Write an enzyme that holds these catalytic residues in place. Structure first.
Site, PDB file in Angstrom:
ATOM      1  N   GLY A  99       3.725   5.723   9.626  1.00  0.00           N
ATOM      2  CA  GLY A  99       5.035   5.439   9.081  1.00  0.00           C
ATOM      3  C   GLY A  99       5.710   4.194   9.614  1.00  0.00           C
ATOM      4  O   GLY A  99       6.831   3.891   9.187  1.00  0.00           O
ATOM      5  N   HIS A 147       0.807  -1.213   0.000  1.00  0.00           N
ATOM      6  CA  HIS A 147       0.000   0.000   0.000  1.00  0.00           C
ATOM      7  C   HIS A 147       0.845   1.270   0.000  1.00  0.00           C
ATOM      8  O   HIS A 147       0.289   2.369   0.100  1.00  0.00           O
ATOM      9  CB  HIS A 147      -0.976  -0.001   1.185  1.00  0.00           C
ATOM     10  CG  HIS A 147      -0.353   0.334   2.506  1.00  0.00           C
ATOM     11  ND1 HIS A 147      -0.008  -0.626   3.433  1.00  0.00           N
ATOM     12  CD2 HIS A 147      -0.045   1.527   3.069  1.00  0.00           C
ATOM     13  CE1 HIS A 147       0.499  -0.041   4.504  1.00  0.00           C
ATOM     14  NE2 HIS A 147       0.492   1.266   4.307  1.00  0.00           N
ATOM     15  N   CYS A 193       4.608   1.062   9.264  1.00  0.00           N
ATOM     16  CA  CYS A 193       4.374  -0.112   8.434  1.00  0.00           C
ATOM     17  C   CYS A 193       5.675  -0.579   7.795  1.00  0.00           C
ATOM     18  O   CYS A 193       6.507   0.228   7.371  1.00  0.00           O
ATOM     19  CB  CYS A 193       3.330   0.194   7.363  1.00  0.00           C
ATOM     20  SG  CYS A 193       1.643   0.235   7.996  1.00  0.00           S
TER      21      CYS A 193
HETATM   22  C1  LIG Z   1       1.485   1.991   8.088  1.00  0.00           C
HETATM   23  N1  LIG Z   1       2.296   2.877   7.617  1.00  0.00           N
HETATM   24  C2  LIG Z   1       0.230   2.327   8.873  1.00  0.00           C
HETATM   25  C3  LIG Z   1       0.345   1.861  10.326  1.00  0.00           C
HETATM   26  C4  LIG Z   1      -0.800   2.396  11.187  1.00  0.00           C
HETATM   27  C5  LIG Z   1      -0.897   3.894  11.359  1.00  0.00           C
HETATM   28  C6  LIG Z   1      -1.627   4.082  12.657  1.00  0.00           C
HETATM   29  N2  LIG Z   1      -1.242   2.888  13.402  1.00  0.00           N
HETATM   30  C7  LIG Z   1      -0.798   1.907  12.624  1.00  0.00           C
HETATM   31  O1  LIG Z   1      -0.464   0.772  13.003  1.00  0.00           O
HETATM   32  N3  LIG Z   1      -0.916   1.737   8.247  1.00  0.00           N
HETATM   33  C8  LIG Z   1      -1.891   2.500   7.785  1.00  0.00           C
HETATM   34  O2  LIG Z   1      -1.851   3.716   7.825  1.00  0.00           O
HETATM   35  C9  LIG Z   1      -3.093   1.783   7.196  1.00  0.00           C
HETATM   36  C10 LIG Z   1      -3.049   1.810   5.678  1.00  0.00           C
HETATM   37  C11 LIG Z   1      -3.901   0.748   5.012  1.00  0.00           C
HETATM   38  C12 LIG Z   1      -4.243   1.147   3.618  1.00  0.00           C
HETATM   39  C13 LIG Z   1      -3.188  -0.567   5.021  1.00  0.00           C
HETATM   40  N4  LIG Z   1      -4.333   2.361   7.645  1.00  0.00           N
HETATM   41  C14 LIG Z   1      -4.772   2.097   8.861  1.00  0.00           C
HETATM   42  O3  LIG Z   1      -4.200   1.348   9.613  1.00  0.00           O
HETATM   43  C15 LIG Z   1      -6.033   2.808   9.303  1.00  0.00           C
HETATM   44  N5  LIG Z   1      -6.949   1.824   9.804  1.00  0.00           N
HETATM   45  C16 LIG Z   1      -8.144   1.714   9.258  1.00  0.00           C
HETATM   46  O4  LIG Z   1      -8.574   2.473   8.434  1.00  0.00           O
HETATM   47  C17 LIG Z   1      -9.014   0.576   9.747  1.00  0.00           C
HETATM   48  F1  LIG Z   1     -10.253   0.709   9.435  1.00  0.00           F
HETATM   49  F2  LIG Z   1      -8.966   0.433  11.020  1.00  0.00           F
HETATM   50  F3  LIG Z   1      -8.652  -0.551   9.280  1.00  0.00           F
HETATM   51  C18 LIG Z   1      -5.816   4.014  10.259  1.00  0.00           C
HETATM   52  C19 LIG Z   1      -5.125   3.577  11.543  1.00  0.00           C
HETATM   53  C20 LIG Z   1      -4.968   5.062   9.556  1.00  0.00           C
HETATM   54  C21 LIG Z   1      -7.137   4.657  10.628  1.00  0.00           C
END
Ligand SMILES: *C(=N)[C@H](C[C@@H]1CCNC1=O)NC(=O)[C@H](CC(C)C)NC(=O)[C@@H](NC(=O)C(F)(F)F)C(C)(C)C
Ligand SMILES: *C(=N)[C@H](C[C@@H]1CCNC1=O)NC(=O)[C@H](CC(C)C)NC(=O)[C@@H](NC(=O)C(F)(F)F)C(C)(C)C
Lengths: 288, 298
Positions: free
Chosen positions: A140, A39, A142
């Site tokens: 950030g 992603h 991930c």
């Molecule tokens: C990776 N860079 C991040 C890690 C997240 C940020 C906040 N805490 C974490 O562990 N991943 C993301 O930003 C996710 C991206 C998707 C496309 C894989 N998005 C989310 O994790 C979002 N979650 C949701 O929308 C969900 F509904 F709960 F699944 C956030 C946390 C941004 C709302």
């Protein structure tokens, strides 16, 4: 008896920053390949990923290894599962002997939480039966990996992807496959009901009796393993034992503590009025 | 909210092994000097150290750093406190910006527990009010260091020396002075009675409210004043609150986000000592001093 974590030095030397057109996360650099969540190229769903990865220009993948001061240049992009395998020109001379091992629920691992390609914190988690970990990640993070070690051999188990709104976190193994029925999409995703990994609850109670005067809330009477399992089926506890290999450890702790496991299981039942209850202690970690 | 450890990579690159006439333990290698416990040359008592150190031949110190493939050669040996400062010919290229900082009770650190010069486990401990740590060590683990990281600088706090009968451990700081009244001798040494670091116990309950359950049924309904608590604390093995005035900025913040003033947490602590009845709070079953207000708040 402590919660033991694996030294993060080997992981630190392989972490890289991955920046694709204004989106930044982490990746791990093994041999000539950098593994990062897919992603980073955008928020897509379903089967759009195949075509969307094919239109991605490699010149846009900014990849840097902070520990080594190297800026990597991508030559080809391959999607494997939900991960991206970015082939780079330079082979990582710090690559250790490694294995891609899937974790079964109830097992522990060390999270090397990283930002901008630099590991910031290290902490311990156990994969729960709902195939989620209860970790801690900000924007950030991930691409952070959960790992274990066994004689200077790196056992990679997890790469972080998404956070759900009940402080749960989901990711993939290093083969690109998620744990449980969760995907990298920003929607509500039904989680299976929580269930206690009974082997680990037994391990914590024994850890308490070994690092403390046997407490008053310890049950006085035994209950059969079979009677516990009929009770467990209606009280969201996993059938005991969850892992037959854990009995070598558990029965060994029952000797050191002079408390049979039948008493420990009845204590779990009586503590229901108090009843999260935590499956963070595995019988292997308490025994060794 | 998790127990956060500092990454150990900086420490692994500087760990070494130190062997002397069959006695083997660990040492850390910073700049041109290797630091290790002094009982590698023998199990001596009292003031025998100054003499026996000055007659130890440098050709009996076998010093290897296995992560770099180097074997080090020792020039001079100097006893600084309970530590040996072994000067070697080679500067450590991996030496970071570092600082020798002595912990006060209640603070946490990451233990890099090593054997034969290689760290095998990392874990988290807090210096207790008995100036002991409740750690995990086996033979050959001496020389293991407890450390913290503030950006780039490595902050060394602890080097391991001795284990006592009650699974407690003691060592020195990197300047060579022990924590508390303990020494590196294989005799029974009196320990001050245990006392909970009340600031950290307050942080544990707040961590539970912010991550596990916002309104658990063991949370006290009524409050007690800080003053009334400290009267109770003097008779119930709890330190005077607050133990550190700088923790108040963290605790007041945790109260604001938890919407639970610290007066209710302090009364909850008092109630739990008579009616915990097996309640498992932040996965611990006992009061733990492992959660600091700084770590839980940040
Ligand atoms: C990776 N860079 C991040 C890690 C997240 C940020 C906040 N805490 C974490 O562990 N991943 C993301 O930003 C996710 C991206 C998707 C496309 C894989 N998005 C989310 O994790 C979002 N979650 C949701 O929308 C969900 F509904 F709960 F699944 C956030 C946390 C941004 C709302
Ligand atoms: C150094 N590598 C070891 C680390 C010990 C071994 C067992 N667990 C540890 O943490 N340190 C020692 O072996 C100590 C050496 C002294 C001379 C400095 N000795 C001890 O720790 C002994 N303890 C005692 O005698 C005492 F009574 F508790 F003080 C042991 C634990 C070996 C009996």
């Amino acid at each position: 008896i402590k919660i033991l974590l694996h030294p993060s030095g080997v992981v630190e030397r392989c972490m890289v920053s991955v920046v694709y057109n204004g989106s930044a996360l982490n990746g791990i650099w093994l041999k000539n390949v950098v593994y990062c969540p897919r992603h980073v190229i955008g928020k897509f769903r379903g089967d759009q990923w195949t075509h969307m990865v094919s239109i991605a220009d490699c010149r846009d993948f900014i990849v840097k290894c902070p520990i080594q001061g190297i800026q990597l240049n991508v030559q080809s992009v391959k999607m494997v599962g939900a991960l991206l395998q970015l082939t780079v020109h330079t082979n990582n001379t710090a690559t250790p002997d490694y294995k891609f091992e899937r974790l079964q629920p109830g097992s522990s691992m060390t999270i090397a939480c990283a930002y901008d390609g630099i590991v910031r914190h290290v902490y311990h988690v156990v994969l729960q039966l709902n195939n989620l970990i209860y970790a801690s990640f900000l924007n950030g993070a991930c691409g952070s990996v959960g790992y274990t070690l066994k004689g200077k051999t790196l056992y990679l188990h997890y790469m972080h992807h998404i956070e759900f709104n009940n402080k749960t976190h989901s990711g993939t193994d290093l083969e690109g496959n998620f744990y449980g029925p969760y995907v990298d999409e920003e929607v509500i995703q039904q989680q299976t009901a929580f269930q206690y990994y009974t082997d680990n609850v037994v391990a914590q109670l024994y850890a308490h009796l070994l690092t403390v005067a046997r407490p008053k809330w310890l049950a006085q009477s035994q209950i059969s393993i079979e009677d516990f399992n009929s009770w467990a089926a209606n009280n969201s506890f996993a059938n005991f034992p969850c892992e037959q290999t854990n009995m070598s450890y558990i029965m060994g702790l029952s000797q050191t503590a002079r408390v049979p496991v039948e008493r420990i299981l009845n204590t779990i039942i009586q503590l229901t009025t108090n009843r999260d209850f935590e499956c963070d202690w595995t019988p292997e970690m308490v025994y060794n």
